[PDB]
Design a binder for this molecule. Structure first.
Ligand SMILES: *[C@@H]1O[C@H](CO)[C@@H](O[C@@H]2O[C@H](CO)[C@@H](O[C@@H]3O[C@H](CO)[C@@H](O)[C@H](O[C@H]4O[C@H](CO)[C@@H](O)[C@H](O)[C@@H]4O)[C@@H]3O)[C@H](O)[C@H]2NC(C)=O)[C@H](O)[C@H]1NC(C)=O
Ligand SMILES: *[C@@H]1O[C@H](CO)[C@@H](O[C@@H]2O[C@H](CO)[C@@H](O[C@@H]3O[C@H](CO)[C@@H](O)[C@H](O)[C@@H]3O)[C@H](O)[C@H]2NC(C)=O)[C@H](O)[C@H]1NC(C)=O
Ligand SMILES: *[C@@H]1O[C@H](CO)[C@@H](O[C@@H]2O[C@H](CO)[C@@H](O[C@@H]3O[C@H](CO)[C@@H](O)[C@H](O)[C@@H]3O)[C@H](O)[C@H]2NC(C)=O)[C@H](O)[C@H]1NC(C)=O
Ligand SMILES: *[C@@H]1O[C@H](CO)[C@@H](O[C@@H]2O[C@H](CO)[C@@H](O[C@@H]3O[C@H](CO)[C@@H](O)[C@H](O)[C@@H]3O)[C@H](O)[C@H]2NC(C)=O)[C@H](O)[C@H]1NC(C)=O
Ligand SMILES: *[C@@H]1O[C@H](CO)[C@@H](O[C@@H]2O[C@H](CO)[C@@H](O[C@@H]3O[C@H](CO)[C@@H](O)[C@H](O)[C@@H]3O)[C@H](O)[C@H]2NC(C)=O)[C@H](O)[C@H]1NC(C)=O
Ligand SMILES: *[C@@H]1O[C@H](CO)[C@@H](O[C@@H]2O[C@H](CO)[C@@H](O[C@@H]3O[C@H](CO)[C@@H](O)[C@H](O)[C@@H]3O)[C@H](O)[C@H]2NC(C)=O)[C@H](O)[C@H]1NC(C)=O
Ligand SMILES: *[C@@H]1O[C@H](CO)[C@@H](O[C@@H]2O[C@H](CO)[C@@H](O)[C@H](O)[C@H]2NC(C)=O)[C@H](O)[C@H]1NC(C)=O
Ligand SMILES: *[C@@H]1O[C@H](CO)[C@@H](O[C@@H]2O[C@H](CO)[C@@H](O)[C@H](O)[C@H]2NC(C)=O)[C@H](O)[C@H]1NC(C)=O
Ligand SMILES: *[C@@H]1O[C@H](CO)[C@@H](O[C@@H]2O[C@H](CO)[C@@H](O)[C@H](O)[C@H]2NC(C)=O)[C@H](O)[C@H]1NC(C)=O
Ligand SMILES: *[C@@H]1O[C@H](CO)[C@@H](O)[C@H](O)[C@H]1NC(C)=O
Ligand SMILES: *[C@@H]1O[C@H](CO)[C@@H](O)[C@H](O)[C@H]1NC(C)=O
Ligand SMILES: *[C@@H]1O[C@H](CO)[C@@H](O)[C@H](O)[C@H]1NC(C)=O
Ligand SMILES: *[C@@H]1O[C@H](CO)[C@@H](O)[C@H](O)[C@H]1NC(C)=O
Ligand SMILES: *[C@@H]1O[C@H](CO)[C@@H](O)[C@H](O)[C@H]1NC(C)=O
Ligand SMILES: *[C@@H]1O[C@H](CO)[C@@H](O)[C@H](O)[C@H]1NC(C)=O
Ligand SMILES: *[C@@H]1O[C@H](CO)[C@@H](O)[C@H](O)[C@H]1NC(C)=O
Ligand SMILES: *[C@@H]1O[C@H](CO)[C@@H](O)[C@H](O)[C@H]1NC(C)=O
Ligand SMILES: *[C@@H]1O[C@H](CO)[C@@H](O)[C@H](O)[C@H]1NC(C)=O
Ligand SMILES: *[C@@H]1O[C@H](CO)[C@@H](O)[C@H](O)[C@H]1NC(C)=O
Ligand SMILES: *[C@@H]1O[C@H](CO)[C@@H](O)[C@H](O)[C@H]1NC(C)=O
Ligand SMILES: *[C@@H]1O[C@H](CO)[C@@H](O)[C@H](O)[C@H]1NC(C)=O
Ligand SMILES: *[C@@H]1O[C@H](CO)[C@@H](O)[C@H](O)[C@H]1NC(C)=O
Ligand SMILES: *[C@@H]1O[C@H](CO)[C@@H](O)[C@H](O)[C@H]1NC(C)=O
Ligand SMILES: *[C@@H]1O[C@H](CO)[C@@H](O)[C@H](O)[C@H]1NC(C)=O
Ligand SMILES: *[C@@H]1O[C@H](CO)[C@@H](O)[C@H](O)[C@H]1NC(C)=O
Ligand SMILES: *[C@@H]1O[C@H](CO)[C@@H](O)[C@H](O)[C@H]1NC(C)=O
Lengths: 135, 121, 442, 112, 121, 135, 135, 48
């Protein structure tokens, strides 16, 4: 049994599989965000610099974003923040093992800033509680 | 019907190369695994390698030290294998067998073809 | 019990965004210049199943990116060689009458001029042969003189097409459809992604596509709004139709020094007979190819309509005639013989009288130009016809007996036949999923 | 959100009698700091709104003796010993702990 | 004295816009919150919005789906509000009330003005 | 009560408040270190690249620096390092709730490298004890 | 006793010492990957940008690589993954306190991708188990 | 009156008003332009 839903499904390969089966393929996705231009006049000189800087900047924005939330250093991390149930009145089995991830983000894209608007508040609140216990 | 067409027989020379094709028909080639099998008349079946006609991920047997390069084509529904540059004692018939899905993987070795006689001389 | 949120990193997500791509060339020149990073010969293409994606042909930025990219390469390659400022002197020209065919009487014009030599204080008399489409009576002056003078194509940097691979930067992906029935725009249930596109030849034309990538199974008529006659119709064949083009003249090249370390190459004295350039295409193959085009084309229009074909609707020589750059010498060719037929419901070649214009005006940016020096001996060409760029004529009444004519000529359409499959998308690794999470409080 | 309802929709009173008005909160308004920022404002008929009680235990400037704010948690009340033309109006109970800072539903004091 | 000067009355037309000013005088405008209030004669007071005359942070009521744009000026000590493009049934008087400090926040609704009659017709 | 000492005081807004009240405003500060130039010839071509690279490099130096100290991924983190009391003989109430942070950094700027010179040594030590316990 | 095998042996100074003694000198090595060009036309203009971007890109590749493995934020971290003993049949004392690190990497450079091919799988597997316990 | 060292005469004194003073400037001549070609695709414009 060599065929297991795993990395060898390919970069972006899990985009066609259910959300639950796509969790194990999250490592093949973070690796292809920096490399690919390792090996090396105006044309293609500035373009190479512009592309490289943008790729570095884009990845950093997510790394910084995970840093504020406190989930940095863990590929799959979750905080203690609850969410307004009105966003999606669906069961766990009704989300993970019966629908693809690609259309999922479209429905919830409206509240991406709102849901982000609760993560950092809790993380700072968690730090403050640790400060109280710390003191 | 699920069939894996293979060339009849190829006569090659030492120091040459081969293009071991394996046609896919009567099914969806983008999902099922593809593997090669040796059927030496005087010896048991041996595992050669495996190619996924998908992501293009390739895996090779431990005893082969990556002596072969595996290529597939999703447009013409075909699979190809390099030896590369085998020798006399490896003159036998290779079978291109179809594997199961990456998820279930239970129907492995579901279907076979006829193979091709590789006789380097 | 009440579910909480979880942070997911790297989950597959796509957003329609377009940015600057990168060039890669296979193992001096004008396209690659040995500057683009080589591409490894393992183009790992991966098939994504259980997915559909949207493709917007004629809105892809890849077409725009390539159009501006090669123009920058053209300007870059023309800077480092001799300018032709001192060639605008008065031209006392004369006809050519030594073994001249009646079909080309008066085309070439033997000319003489007092162009200066390398020493600033000395002159010299030099004679050269110019085509009729390069001089104008005032006795004669170059066509481009009253416009900005242009340089001379650096003799060494050939303009022979070279496949170029386009690869997106890290964090971006390129998706290509694979359905054989793909229209101009619409979902494709065979989506796949690859980091680099296949070889794309930037070869140029205006009427007939040359050395293009043929269709998969059947002739495809890729077009946006079709009832609108104002927009071009792009046709891609399925079996190539061989085209032969040749220059029968045995031309010779003369080198004239213009200044310190600056030389100009002229034409003549010609050797041998004087025969018009001609291109050849098989009669049987073309009739079959056109018959297949109308068959598929008849599925989008009335079945009883009498489809007709005709030459272009006139205009400037740049867009009125077929153009190509075989062997480094430009040809402008009259293709009236490839559209003289009518189709009703239910000998081995064609002679195409061609034309040559050494002075070349590139993309309709009028401030630029370049010189095309001659090449010794005859030039032979073997190319493949892969499609046509037709235009719909207006004034049709009741949509009956519709006809099309070749036209367009915009360079963007030529690459659109090669970049229609490929689109650029952005990866959104971040995501949030609702489940029953309880963070381990310290 | 936390709604603010008041039982008296109409309150018939003659000059020289004690007036009673109350308000309710769906959820307790006790803030973490240990205070209730509820405000009792009597909006005059056409004039600018004017607060009468803030921090219901505390009272505003220009103290009227008749007005006596009291109440905590869910129940809020304001007792007036005597009625004057100024007392005739509309009272609003305004919460000051949660979002939004909702006002009261309005209790009307009129003579019939 | 802490006063919030307001325009008397504005008569606008459907499809037009308004510049609802609110002058600040007799205090420091860079600290106190500013909020707007509706005083429909036949209905109770309604919360319209709030603008922080410092960082420029803006908050809007849930029922309004961000129909208004709030702007302030720290040089002239003024506050402005857009509707934007209100309709007939919203023809009433709006009051620009001064809030408390972002730290204490207890003195909210300390002072009011006179309002302005918005009658789109 | 919508007015609480919080993010909406504005980027750099806490610079006028006391040190204690400025702790809750540390999230609005990390967000404005990368963005602002997301949306896009020599003049302004190289300048854009120089500015973008410098901003990316500057943020990296702090992210690296927090990484060596072991505080990476926690916006408010602390170690077990004691400090020489001679630097500031002041009480907690005499530091946090009675003076602004801006003039604070000026006084102790002298020992910024010295105080940094103790953080990394202990973090490497703390790893060493974990290795000893690990083994 | 001021002379202890420590940072003051110099950047890259542990390359001549045994592997065990080089563990304490891993902090002087991470500091010299970004700085050195802090203080500041075609020649030397594009070169400075190319060098700076490459240095930033190279460091990020390792930071991302450690992030996927889950060891980010810890200079010395180890997972629970076992290793095929056939790669090096040597004792701990036979590796750390008797041989330099420079020639070490040469012998096991063959399996650098293979050994990396097990780290990320375990880290994702660790997260999945945490998800199971989490749920 | 924004100025550095003021007792020193060697440095300029910068003055900023508070109410603008309107300034009118005009050229009364009805000039015409003549285009003269100097070279290939290079033109010079003269006066009169
Ligand atoms: C469509 O594709 C076909 C397939 O290649 C292509 O035909 C090619 O044409 C070129 C141009 O003639 C051929 O290469 C030339 O061959 C002649 C004869 O051997 C040479 O003399 C030429 O050398 C000149 O050009 C060199 C630079 O390219 C100079 O360095 C040199 O000094 C000479 O000036 C040149 O090598 C080529 O062989 C064919 N290919 C095939 C397979 O036949 C056709 O041109 C393409 N269509 C268009 C419109 O370009
Ligand atoms: C694309 O969609 C098709 C829809 O039919 C998927 O087919 C289904 O694939 C699964 C696994 O790949 C097959 O096995 C099933 O697995 C589940 C979970 O282990 C098990 O509970 C079931 O009993 C079954 O064995 C399944 O038979 C097959 N057919 C169905 C669902 O009708 C396909 O897997 C999808 N592929 C990708 C890459 O998303
Ligand atoms: C123009 O069209 C003709 C077809 O009319 C093309 O000829 C084809 O060329 C390809 C290679 O480009 C040939 O395939 C090759 O076959 C050899 C074995 O002969 C194999 O070793 C190669 O790997 C490759 O597969 C193909 O057989 C050939 N077909 C015919 C009918 O001749 C020609 O290539 C086209 N030229 C251009 C510039 O587009
Ligand atoms: C492109 O080529 C075509 C032919 O290959 C050119 O059309 C040809 O035009 C000439 C000039 O009018 C025609 O000759 C004359 O035709 C009239 C028709 O009544 C006849 O009465 C005269 O005696 C004379 O023969 C010629 O017939 C015609 N060719 C065909 C096949 O009809 C066309 O002008 C060329 N266009 C360009 C821009 O080069
Ligand atoms: C700028 O400095 C002034 C100095 O007067 C600050 O004024 C003081 O601000 C505080 C809160 O903003 C006021 O409330 C006080 O809060 C503390 C802590 O909750 C509490 O223990 C006190 O009893 C008091 O209620 C205080 O009344 C006010 N006046 C003073 C201190 O004399 C102002 O807050 C500072 N603003 C900023 C943005 O730093
Ligand atoms: C370079 O190689 C020489 C090889 O001789 C090293 O010489 C040895 O250095 C060690 C410490 O530097 C000396 O002390 C020894 O320390 C160990 C561990 O604390 C202790 O168990 C021994 O009893 C001894 O005291 C040792 O005497 C000396 N000579 C030897 C090993 O024959 C030198 O240290 C190396 N230097 C570097 C920078 O790698
Ligand atoms: C293109 O086709 C024409 C037409 O067949 C060819 O013209 C022939 O030229 C030869 C001389 O080389 C004559 O003997 C024939 O009589 C001509 N044919 C006709 C029908 O008149 C021409 O040679 C072809 N050229 C190429 C390059 O294929
Ligand atoms: C086009 O030109 C070629 C070469 O001049 C003609 O000859 C063919 O050349 C190809 C090789 O490129 C051979 O495979 C064919 O067998 C040749 N054909 C013949 C008849 O000799 C070719 O015939 C020309 N075709 C046309 C339509 O003009
Ligand atoms: C297209 O073909 C037609 C053939 O009918 C050409 O029409 C002739 O054009 C020539 C000059 O181009 C005239 O001298 C004739 O009088 C025209 N005859 C007719 C019947 O129209 C037309 O010129 C061609 N145009 C192009 C652009 O190729
Ligand atoms: C429900 O949504 C509101 C905003 O519409 C938000 O303030 C609240 O936090 C949400 N509920 C939860 C439990 O997050
Ligand atoms: C999300 O927003 C879009 C436009 O902003 C809207 O059309 C759609 O109905 C919204 N969906 C939900 C679930 O709120
Ligand atoms: C030259 O050729 C042109 C072409 O039309 C002709 O008009 C002219 O008379 C010719 N002159 C001589 C001298 O042959
Ligand atoms: C070139 O110079 C000669 C010698 O004076 C003169 O006869 C001739 O006319 C000149 N030609 C031109 C084109 O000026
Ligand atoms: C140059 O002369 C040609 C000859 O007719 C003319 O068509 C063109 O418009 C002229 N261009 C300019 C810029 O004068
Ligand atoms: C492709 O697009 C055209 C134009 O919108 C549409 O008419 C057609 O149905 C689409 N699909 C195919 C297969 O042509
Ligand atoms: C163009 O497209 C529109 C809608 O996309 C359609 O109504 C119209 O018939 C098409 N043709 C023309 C000529 O407008
Ligand atoms: C052009 O004219 C010159 C001058 O008479 C002559 O020497 C030369 O041979 C002519 N060239 C041709 C091709 O007729
Ligand atoms: C081309 O096909 C048409 C279609 O009927 C036919 O009428 C014509 O004779 C054919 N021409 C040749 C040269 O085969
Ligand atoms: C034309 O005929 C084909 C079959 O030969 C048919 O499929 C098609 O629908 C017909 N066209 C129209 C407009 O009906
Ligand atoms: C088309 O070809 C026929 C064949 O003889 C000829 O009579 C006719 O004039 C041609 N028409 C055109 C427009 O080329
Ligand atoms: C052109 O003529 C010259 C004259 O000697 C000859 O050497 C050369 O081979 C000819 N070129 C061709 C292509 O016949
Ligand atoms: C006191 O300062 C000295 C250096 O002056 C330093 O070595 C020592 O560690 C400091 N004390 C503490 C407890 O850090
Ligand atoms: C800090 O250093 C400066 C100059 O290095 C010095 O003037 C000042 O007195 C020092 N302060 C303390 C507290 O050591
Ligand atoms: C031993 O090596 C094989 C590959 O040769 C690998 O699959 C296996 O995981 C290794 N053993 C261990 C314990 O890692
Ligand atoms: C490592 O690989 C090299 C070449 O790939 C080989 O020469 C060497 O023997 C290998 N060493 C081991 C221990 O496998
Ligand atoms: C300039 O400044 C110095 C000190 O800043 C002051 O002593 C002197 O009077 C000023 N004026 C001149 C003319 O130096």
């Amino acid at each position: 049994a060599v065929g297991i839903g795993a990395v060898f499904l390919g970069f972006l390969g899990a985009a066609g599989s259910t959300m639950g089966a796509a969790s194990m393929t999250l490592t093949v996705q973070a690796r292809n965000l920096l490399s690919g231009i390792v090996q090396q006049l105006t044309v293609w000189g500035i373009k190479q610099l512009q592309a490289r800087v943008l790729a570095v900047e884009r990845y950093l924005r997510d790394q910084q974003l995970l840093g504020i939330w406190g989930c940095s250093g863990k590929l799959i991390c979750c905080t203690n923040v609850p969410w307004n149930s009105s966003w999606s009145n669906r069961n766990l089995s009704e989300i993970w093992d019966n629908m693809t991830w690609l259309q999922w983000d479209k429905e919830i894209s409206n509240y991406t800033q709102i849901i982000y608007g609760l993560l950092e508040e809790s993380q700072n609140q968690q730090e403050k509680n640790e400060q109280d216990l710390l003191a | 019907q699920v069939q894996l067409q293979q060339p009849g027989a190829e006569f090659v020379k030492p120091g040459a190369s081969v293009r071991m094709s394996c046609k896919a028909s009567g099914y969806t080639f983008t999902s099922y695994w593809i593997a090669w099998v040796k059927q030496r008349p005087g010896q048991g079946l041996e595992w050669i390698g495996d190619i996924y006609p998908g992501s293009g991920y390739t895996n090779y047997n431990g005893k082969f030290k990556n002596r072969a390069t595996l290529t597939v084509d999703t447009s013409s529904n075909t699979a190809y294998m390099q030896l590369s540059s085998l020798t006399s004692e490896d003159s036998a018939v290779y079978y291109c067998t179809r594997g199961g899905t990456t998820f279930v993987a239970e129907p492995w070795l579901a279907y076979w073809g006829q193979g091709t006689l590789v006789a380097v001389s | 019990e009440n579910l909480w949120v979880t942070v997911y990193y790297g989950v597959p997500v796509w957003k329609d965004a377009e940015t600057t791509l990168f060039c890669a060339s296979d193992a001096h020149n004008v396209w690659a210049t040995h500057a683009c990073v080589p591409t490894d010969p393992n183009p790992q293409e991966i098939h994504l199943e259980n997915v559909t994606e949207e493709f917007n042909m004629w809105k892809n930025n890849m077409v725009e990116q390539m159009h501006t990219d090669i123009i920058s390469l053209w300007d870059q390659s023309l800077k480092p060689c001799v300018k032709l400022t001192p060639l605008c002197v008065t031209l006392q020209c004369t006809n050519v009458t030594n073994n001249i065919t009646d079909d080309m009487r008066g085309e070439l014009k033997n000319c003489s001029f007092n162009m200066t030599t390398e020493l600033r204080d000395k002159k010299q008399k030099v004679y050269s042969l110019f085509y009729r489409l390069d001089v104008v009576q005032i006795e004669y002056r170059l066509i481009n003189c009253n416009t900005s003078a242009c340089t001379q194509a650096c003799p060494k940097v050939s303009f022979e097409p070279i496949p170029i691979h386009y690869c997106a930067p890290a964090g971006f992906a390129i998706l290509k459809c694979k359905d054989k029935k793909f229209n101009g725009t619409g979902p494709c249930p065979s989506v796949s992604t690859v980091q680099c596109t296949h070889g794309i030849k930037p070869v140029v034309s205006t009427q007939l596509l040359l050395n293009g990538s043929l269709a998969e199974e059947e002739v495809m008529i890729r077009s946006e709004n079709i009832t609108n006659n104002a927009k071009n119709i792009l046709v891609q064949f399925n079996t190539p139709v061989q085209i032969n083009c040749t220059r029968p003249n045995n031309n010779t090249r003369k080198s004239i020094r213009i200044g310190p370390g600056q030389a100009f190459y002229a034409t003549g004295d010609i050797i041998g007979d004087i025969r018009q350039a001609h291109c050849n295409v098989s009669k049987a193959t073309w009739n079959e190819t056109l018959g297949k085009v109308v068959k598929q084309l008849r599925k989008h229009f009335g079945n009883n309509t009498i489809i007709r074909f005709a030459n272009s609707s006139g205009g400037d020589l740049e867009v009125t005639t077929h153009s190509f750059n075989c062997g480094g010498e430009f040809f402008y060719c009259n293709t009236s013989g490839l559209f003289n037929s009518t189709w009703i419901s239910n000998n081995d070649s064609i002679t195409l009288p061609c034309r040559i214009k050494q002075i070349i005006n590139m993309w309709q940016r009028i401030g630029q130009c370049m010189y095309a020096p001659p090449i010794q001996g005859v030039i032979r060409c073997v190319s493949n016809i892969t499609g046509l760029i037709l235009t719909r004529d207006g004034g049709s009444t009741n949509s009956t007996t519709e006809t099309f004519r070749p036209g367009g000529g915009d360079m963007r359409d030529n690459w659109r036949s090669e970049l229609y499959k490929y689109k650029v998308v952005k990866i959104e690794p971040l995501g949030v999923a609702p489940t029953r999470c309880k963070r381990r409080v310290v | 959100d936390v709604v603010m309802t008041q039982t008296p929709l109409t309150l018939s009173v003659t000059i020289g009698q004690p007036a009673s008005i109350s308000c309710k909160s769906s959820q307790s308004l006790l803030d973490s700091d240990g205070k209730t920022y509820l405000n009792w404002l009597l909006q005059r008929p056409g004039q600018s709104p004017k607060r009468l009680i803030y921090l219901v235990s505390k009272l505003d400037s220009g103290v009227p003796d008749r007005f006596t704010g009291s109440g905590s948690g869910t129940d809020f009340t304001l007792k007036i010993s005597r009625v004057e033309a100024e007392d005739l109006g509309i009272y609003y109970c305004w919460q000051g702990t949660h979002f939004p800072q909702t006002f009261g539903g309005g209790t009307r004091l009129e003579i019939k």
